[PDB]
Design a protein around this ligand. Sequence first.
Ligand SMILES: [Zn+2]
Ligand SMILES: [Zn+2]
Lengths: 350, 350
Amino acid sequence: YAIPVDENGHRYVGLVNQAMTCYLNSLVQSLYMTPEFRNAMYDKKAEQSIPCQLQKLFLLLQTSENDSLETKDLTQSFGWTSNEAYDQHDVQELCRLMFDALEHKWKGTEHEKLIQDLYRGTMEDFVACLKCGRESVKTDYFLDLPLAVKPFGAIHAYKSVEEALTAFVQPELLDGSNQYMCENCKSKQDAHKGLRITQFPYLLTIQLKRFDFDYNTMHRIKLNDKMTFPDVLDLNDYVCVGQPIDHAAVDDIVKTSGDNVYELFSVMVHSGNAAGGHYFAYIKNLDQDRWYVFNDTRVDFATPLEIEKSFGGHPSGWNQSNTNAYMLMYRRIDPKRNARFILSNQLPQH
Amino acid sequence: YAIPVDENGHRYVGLVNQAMTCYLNSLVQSLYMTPEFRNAMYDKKAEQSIPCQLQKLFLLLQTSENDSLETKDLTQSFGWTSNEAYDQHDVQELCRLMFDALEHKWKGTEHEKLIQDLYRGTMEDFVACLKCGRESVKTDYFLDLPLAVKPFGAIHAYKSVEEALTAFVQPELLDGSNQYMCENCKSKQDAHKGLRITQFPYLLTIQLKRFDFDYNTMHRIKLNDKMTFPDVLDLNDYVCVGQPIDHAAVDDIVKTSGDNVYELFSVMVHSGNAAGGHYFAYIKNLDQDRWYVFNDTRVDFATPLEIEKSFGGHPSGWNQSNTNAYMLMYRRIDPKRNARFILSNQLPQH
Ligand SMILES: [Zn+2]
Ligand SMILES: [Zn+2]
């Protein structure tokens, strides 16, 4: 008989219908439900600024009592006036456009390193000669973890996010026909080439490569292979029901067995055909550890079965009603860094 | 002491410098050196029409005695006025834009089926239940053969185009966690899902997926793994030095062992960094069986070693001067269908 309310005791507010906006609503809500992000969003006409429109929409989403909110001014601030704008852009491009604008405005403030302190991880890609042992390494940064679901030529698709991440750090063996020209050996030798992660982001974004673009269609296509992912992700080695409520204790056990533990709080999913389909997301309020389904004008309680179905699985054919997740958002579990949503009664003005 | 001349005894004409046009010149020349395509290109102000600009450029490339030609009117007919237009588009998108315009103009003529008669192959993607044996198939068309070089998580990259094509038709096994919901079995069962080719195009285009787009850069990246490809490609099973002159006899031997034999005539390659680099192509005149390097304002004789280097291979590091091929163009060997370049003295007017 209850209703979804915010930490403030205020009803959750939805967004307008996804009139070809695709991932837009799911992305906005997922960012609005990030504590550090929303907390940082507070402190001629510059109405075209992405930060100001995002700040107006966040304040409305937190204080307004309506059911749905408009996103016409936000997509105007992006400059994406075309009707097919979101069909021709990946969600990662929109995340980069918003983060670039926020970084450009926050330059010189106490939030100029905020975006990279939250979302940036560091890895290094190397080439290790197997004869002499010398390496050539270069350090890379990343804001996403781009994991494939079913690689080209694969006989089995990855059954879990962990399995895809393991293959993501798998060293490629450079032998036979494509050996490596070693400078120390001054000749072609067998070698290892690949990635290795040195620091995961504080806010971990995982892209599940279900969406591909067929150029012969030329429309979007989507893999429906089943891939699992937990609420508590243990990534210590890189340096099945998780939908219900988290263990406060097992997380401490994993902390005693490594420091890189992550808590799932956003599951952005898609249904129907890939040439469009219906986008929405399952987002968890981290302060109250409660899951909710954010679907356009309707924010409702989410059940563990509803979220668990987003693991995917091949249906009967091209019927073809099926919902699976394409993006995941985790937050590192640090009882010292982890911030809570500041309450609405702490806002200075309106 | 000789000079590259056309079948007409006329010197080959180059194009202007690739001022951020990337694959444009290599694509134009490869289409201009296709016999059926160039032969079909002959028979308010509609200057914005893609076909008319392509026809003007082809006639100039065939009759003009200059060294280089301008491509400003062609890129204007595309509508790609932006300086970063070719950086933000794949070459397959440009091929589709040109073919769509040609098909739209050729509608109702004797060339309305020309584009699909030359470049379109047919395949079918299926789901075969391993218990009951029933299949659900749907027929697909394709203008490209998108072959990966190094798939996600792969330990070894494909050493040849044939190996990547074999993995391209490799059936995925749907068992364990992602079984297939069979409608005849009314339950989840193990199954096979994948592609199988029923008819290769008369003009076979092969895309080598060396170019990927890193969203964390966010620039283009390129794999440098060595992958071979022959001049005589035997694709019978799907229904190392090939750079020198073709066997007229071995091709007949392969014809006695299957009908789908293809002759390589275009090798579009790229050098340097992927964030840009230098684009050019090795194209063969099929009438005279002679290889030439088309590099901007310079068309020269191509040696077998120059073309064989385009197989790739990992250099010493990120130095990183290295040239490898991203696209291949084959023509089916049919002494009845295979057309020759009609001579310039057969043109009606100028
Ligand atoms: Zn070495
Ligand atoms: Zn069955």
